[PDB]
Ligand binder design. Sequence first.
Ligand SMILES: CCCCCCCC/C=C\CCCCCCCC(=O)O[C@@H](COC(=O)CCCCCCCCCCCCCCC)COP(=O)([O-])OCC[N+](C)(C)C
Ligand SMILES: CCCCCCCC/C=C\CCCCCCCC(=O)O[C@@H](COC(=O)CCCCCCCCCCCCCCC)COP(=O)([O-])OCC[N+](C)(C)C
Ligand SMILES: CCCCCCCC/C=C\CCCCCCCC(=O)O[C@@H](COC(=O)CCCCCCCCCCCCCCC)COP(=O)([O-])OCC[N+](C)(C)C
Ligand SMILES: CCCCCCCC/C=C\CCCCCCCC(=O)O[C@@H](COC(=O)CCCCCCCCCCCCCCC)COP(=O)([O-])OCC[N+](C)(C)C
Lengths: 49, 804, 48
Amino acid sequence: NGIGIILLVLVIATLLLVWTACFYRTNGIVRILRYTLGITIIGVPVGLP
Amino acid sequence: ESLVVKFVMFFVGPIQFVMEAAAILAAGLSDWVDFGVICGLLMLNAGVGFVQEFQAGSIVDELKKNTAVVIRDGQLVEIPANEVVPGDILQLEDGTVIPTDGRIVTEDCFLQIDQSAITGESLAVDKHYGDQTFSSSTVKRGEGFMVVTATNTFVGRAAALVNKAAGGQGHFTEVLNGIGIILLVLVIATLLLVWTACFYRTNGIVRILRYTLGITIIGVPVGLPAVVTTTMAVGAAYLAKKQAIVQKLSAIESLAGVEILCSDKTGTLTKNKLSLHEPYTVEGVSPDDLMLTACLAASRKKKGLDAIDKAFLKSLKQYPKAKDALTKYKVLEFHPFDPVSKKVTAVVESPEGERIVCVKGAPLFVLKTVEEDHPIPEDVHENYENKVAELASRGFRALGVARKRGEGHWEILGVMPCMDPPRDDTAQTVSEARHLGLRVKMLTGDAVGIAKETCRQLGLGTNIYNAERLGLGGGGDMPGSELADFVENADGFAEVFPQHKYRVVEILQNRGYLVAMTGDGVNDAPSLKKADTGIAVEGATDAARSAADIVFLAPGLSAIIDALKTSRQIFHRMYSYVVYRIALSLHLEIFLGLWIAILDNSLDIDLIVFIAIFADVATLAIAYDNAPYSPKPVKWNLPRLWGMSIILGIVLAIGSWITLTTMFLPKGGIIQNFGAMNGIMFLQISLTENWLIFITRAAGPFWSSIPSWQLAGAVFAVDIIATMFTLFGWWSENWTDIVTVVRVWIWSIGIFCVLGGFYYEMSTSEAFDRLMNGKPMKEKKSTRSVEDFMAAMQRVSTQHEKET
Amino acid sequence: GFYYEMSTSEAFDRLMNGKPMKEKKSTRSVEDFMAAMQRVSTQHEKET
Ligand SMILES: CCCCCCCC/C=C\CCCCCCCC(=O)O[C@@H](COC(=O)CCCCCCCCCCCCCCC)COP(=O)([O-])OCC[N+](C)(C)C
Ligand SMILES: CCCCCCCC/C=C\CCCCCCCC(=O)O[C@@H](COC(=O)CCCCCCCCCCCCCCC)COP(=O)([O-])OCC[N+](C)(C)C
Ligand SMILES: CCCCCCCC/C=C\CCCCCCCC(=O)O[C@@H](COC(=O)CCCCCCCCCCCCCCC)COP(=O)([O-])OCC[N+](C)(C)C
Ligand SMILES: CCCCCCCC/C=C\CCCCCCCC(=O)O[C@@H](COC(=O)CCCCCCCCCCCCCCC)COP(=O)([O-])OCC[N+](C)(C)C
C-alpha cells in the first residue's frame, strides 16, 4: 500500500506532464487519451500485489 | 422570526455597511453591472450566515430535546415537567425520564440511568445517595427521591453558551483576528499589484475598480468568522451530547490540543466502589465456598448493611445472588461490629441439629481467635501474613473468615481481598488514549506500591513516584532539571496532594506541554485553573466545576477520551475549512492578481461572484460531514497553517495559469472545438477550488476518509452548476463544447491529485512544521542519555516503592 | 504593514543593533536554577 501509492503518484506526475504538453499542442482528447492509456499500462503494475 | 434574522445580517455589521454603502454609490451612478455584484454578495453573505445559524439552531434545539411526580402538601400528585420549581423534591421510578437536574436523597436499592439522550448508547451509570442526575436521562433500574437543582441546567447552560457564541468570542476568535489581518494584508498586497499595473497601462478608474471589486470578493472571505465560530458553537452542543459541558468555547480547542492528561485514579480510572477478586484468594478449602461463608457473617437488612458488607452480599456468582446466603441457614444469633474487636460473626443452625459458627473480621484479629488451631502454627502465621503482605503489595485491603464446627474449635477458612477495581473499559481506554497521541499520568492518593499495581492493571507502565519524596513540594536533593524529567516521563504520582497537583501541571507546562488535569474536589481548583484544560470529572463540587474548563457528567476516562476524540473532530472541521478558504483566497489573488498585472484582464465580475458563492456552498455541508480527527494533538500551528495554505494557493494558481496559457495559443490549447477564455477559467477555478475541501478535510491523505454525502453532494452540485455555466456560456462570451469541458474536468482532476499530494506530504512532515515555525530541534537528549535516564527512573521508582 | 512587522520584531531589533543573543541560559539550566532559588529562599525562611 505504500509502494502502490508512490507508483500512482508517479503515474499522475507524468500524466500531468503529458496532458499539459498535449494541451499546448492542441491535441484532440482522443489522442491524449491514447497517451494516458499507454502510460497507465506501463505506469501501474497490477502484478506486484 | 426566521425572516427577521435574515435582515439583521444585512444591516448589522460594518463590513456589510461598507458593501451596501457601495451598493448605493454604484446604483446612484446607475452602474448596474456592479450593482448586481455587490447586492449579489449581500444575498450571499447574509444568505450563508443564515443557513449557518439555521444549522446551529437546529442542533441546539435538538439538544434542548414530559411529566414529573412530586409531592404537594404530602400528597402524591403528577404534574407536567413545566410546573417543577427548582428547590423541590421529586419522586423517581424505574423507566422514568428525568425532567430536571436533581440530586438523589437516599436509595434503598441504588439506581442506574442512561446518559444517552441523543446517542441511544446502551451503557448506564450507577447513581447513589447525593449523586447528581441530569435531565433527558432515563432510569434503567432503581427507585427513589431526587432533589432538583435547577430546571439553568447544564444543558440549558450549554445551549445558552451556544446562542451567546453566535456573537463570537474565545481564543480562536483571537486567532480569527490574526488570520483576518493576514488575508487583508494579502488583499492589499495584490491590490497594490493590480493598481500599479493598471496605472502604467493607463486604465480608467472604473476599469481598475472592477478589478478591485473582483479581488475583494475572492480576497476577503467573510465566511470564516461565521463558520469557525459556528463550528465551535455546534461543537459545544456536540460535546454536551458526549456529556461534556465546556465552560468556554476555547475549551474545545484546548481539549483538542492537550498532550498530557493527568487523570486522578479514584474516579476516572477505577470504579470508586469496592469489589473482590476470587483468583487472588488464599488456598482455603473453598475459594468459591469461602465467599458464601462471609455472606453468612453479614446481616442482609439495612440495619446492618455496612458498605464493606454490602459489597460481599453482591459478589456471588450463583443465580440466587442475595437469597443463597439465607437459604435454610436459620440464623439464631448475630454479633454486630464492635470497633475494639474488629469482628462480626453469625451462628446458624444446620438441618441435622448442628450449631455452626462463622466469623468475619480483620486478619490480625481473625488470626488470634485460636492461635494454635491450624496445623504448622508458626508457618500458618507466616504464610497468611505474607499473603496479607502481598495483598498490600497489590494494595488490596484484606478481610478474613474463620469457621466453627460448633464445639468451639476454630477453623481458619481464609482471607479474601476487596479492592477498588479498574473500570472494564479503562484498560482499553488507556490503550486508546495512547493511540490518540496523548500521555496519561495517574495521580493517586494511594501509596507507591498500591498504585504500581493499578498501573499494571491498566497497562499504564508502572513507573510511579511518591509525590512528596520525589520533589513536588519544594524540597528534595533532585535538581529542578531532573525533577522536570521525572515528572515529564513519569507514568504516575502516588501519594499526591493538591499542593503537588499544582506542581505537576506547572512543571509540565514549563516543558511546553498542554496539560489536562482532572479535578474532583474544592482543593483541586487551583490546579484546574492552572491546567491548560482543567476537567471537572463526574461528582465534582461547585468549586471544581467553576474552576474547570470542561465539566463532565459521565464518569470514567473513556468519557474524557471520547470528548477528546470529538474535540479533535470539531477542531479539524474548523481547521480544514480555514486551510481551505485561505488557499482559495491565495489561489485567486495570485491568479487574478497576475492576470491583471501581466495581461490586463480578469475573470468577469459576474463570474467572480459565483466563485465566491461556490466556495461558501462548501460551508453549508462542512457542518454535516463525518468528521475525521487527527491522531496526534492539534494546535492551530499558524506558521504551518499559513505554509500549507500559501503552498496550496501557489500550486492552485500554477494549475490555473497553465490552462489559461494554453488558451493563448492559436488552435485553442485546452479548447478542442470552441470555447471561451472565461467560461473555461471559471470552470477550472470552480473545480479545483471546491475539490480542495476533499483534500483538507482528511486527517491524513484525501483517500483515507471518504467524504459524507452532504459534502460530496454539495461539492458535486456546484461542479454541475459550474459546468452548466461553461457549456451554455452564462455570463461568458461563448458556449464551450462538451469535449472541452471534459478536458477541463480531467485536467482539474489532475490538479486535485497534485494538491492532494502536496498537502499530504506537507501536512504530515515535521520538516515542514520545523521550517515554517523556524524552531530548530534544540533539546534532543542523547540516545545514550535517554537509556541512562530511563533506567534512572526505574531505579528511583523502585526506591519509592521500598520506603513503605 | 512594514512598520508593524518591523517595530515589534526582535529579529529586526537584533539586526539593527548588531547585538547577538549572547547570554541565553539552557532551558534545563533555568529549571535547575529556578528550583535553586526556591530551595534557598526556603532556607532563608528557616533561619528565623
Ligand atoms: C517566486 C516569486 C515570483 C512571483 C511570480 C512571477 C510571475 C511573473 C513572471 C513573468 C511575467 C512576465 C510575462 C511576460 C509577458 C510578455 C508579453 C506581455 O504581455 O507583457 C505584458 C507586460 O508584462 C508585464 O508587465 C509583467 C509584469 C508582471 C510582474 C509581476 C511580479 C510581481 C511578483 C508578486 C507575485 C504576485 C502575487 C500577488 C500577491 C499575493 C505586456 O503589457 P500589456 O499591454 O499590459 O499586455 C497586453 C494588454 N492588453 C491585452 C490589454 C492589450
Ligand atoms: C520578483 C518577480 C520578478 C518578475 C519579473 C518580471 C519580468 C517581466 C518583464 C517584462 C516582460 C516582457 C516585457 C516586454 C514584452 C515585449 C514588449 C511589447 O511587445 O510591447 C509592449 C511594450 O510595453 C512594454 O514596454 C512592456 C514593459 C513591461 C515591463 C514591466 C516590468 C515588470 C517589473 C516587475 C518587478 C517586480 C518587483 C517585485 C520584487 C519585490 C506593449 O504590449 P502591446 O503592444 O500593448 O500588446 C501586447 C504585446 N505582446 C502581445 C506582443 C506582448
Ligand atoms: C510556473 C509557471 C507556469 C505558467 C508558465 C506559462 C508559460 C507559457 C507562456 C506563454 C505560452 C505561449 C503564449 C503566446 C504564444 C502565441 C503568441 C500569442 O498568441 O500572443 C499571446 C500573448 O500573451 C502572452 O504573451 C502570454 C504571457 C504568459 C505569461 C504567463 C505568466 C506566468 C506567471 C505564473 C506565476 C504563477 C505562480 C505564482 C507564484 C507567486 C496572446 O495573448 P492574448 O491577448 O491573451 O490572446 C490573444 C488571442 N489569441 C492569442 C488566441 C490570438
Ligand atoms: C518553474 C517555472 C517554469 C517556467 C516555464 C517557462 C515557460 C516559457 C516557455 C515558452 C514561452 C514562450 C513560448 C514561445 C511560443 C510562441 C512562438 C511564436 O510564434 O511567437 C509568438 C510571440 O510570443 C509572444 O508574443 C509573447 C509570448 C512569450 C512570453 C512567455 C513568457 C513566459 C513567462 C514565464 C513565467 C515563469 C515565472 C514562474 C516563477 C515561479 C507569436 O507572436 P506573433 O509573432 O506576434 O504573432 C502570432 C501569430 N499567430 C497568432 C498566428 C501565431
